[PDB]
DNA sequence: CTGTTTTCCACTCGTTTTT
DNA sequence: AAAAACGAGTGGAAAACAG
């Protein structure tokens, strides 16, 4: 039922991630995490060329997976 | 320290895209 | 037709927390 992330969208999320590295990545933390994530989700869902609206869980899952499957460029 | 709660990540499943 | 990629669920490791 739910679509997939477009290329452009992936670039957007990657950009946001690279920006807020120091807050969401354990490897940089060593403030509100939830609010930072919410900020990212908001910025994404507000982005014009967005396919579908996502919740915080989906975004986080994309973060986790893109790291797992080693495609996170930053 | 011990014991509880929260957050992160490897493994995997069912489907969909790509070779 | 086979392999790779993708979204998603989960258990338990790792970490953060309370006493």
Swiss-Prot record:
Involved in transvection phenomena (= synapsis-dependent gene expression), where the synaptic pairing of chromosomes carrying genes with which zeste interacts influences the expression of these genes. Zeste binds to DNA and stimulates transcription from a nearby promoter. Residues 1-72 bind DNA. Self-associates forming complexes of several hundred monomers. It is found in: Nucleus. This is Regulatory protein zeste. It comes from Drosophila melanogaster.
């Amino acid at each position: 039922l739910t679509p997939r992330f477009t290329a452009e969208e992936k670039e957007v999320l990657y950009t946001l991630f690279h920006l807020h590295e120091e807050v969401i990545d354990i490897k940089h933390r060593k403030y509100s995490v939830r609010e930072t994530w919410d900020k990212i989700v908001k910025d994404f869902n507000s982005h014009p060329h967005v396919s579908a609206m996502r919740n915080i869980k989906q975004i986080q899952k994309f973060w986790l997976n893109s790291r797992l499957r080693k495609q996170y460029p930053y």
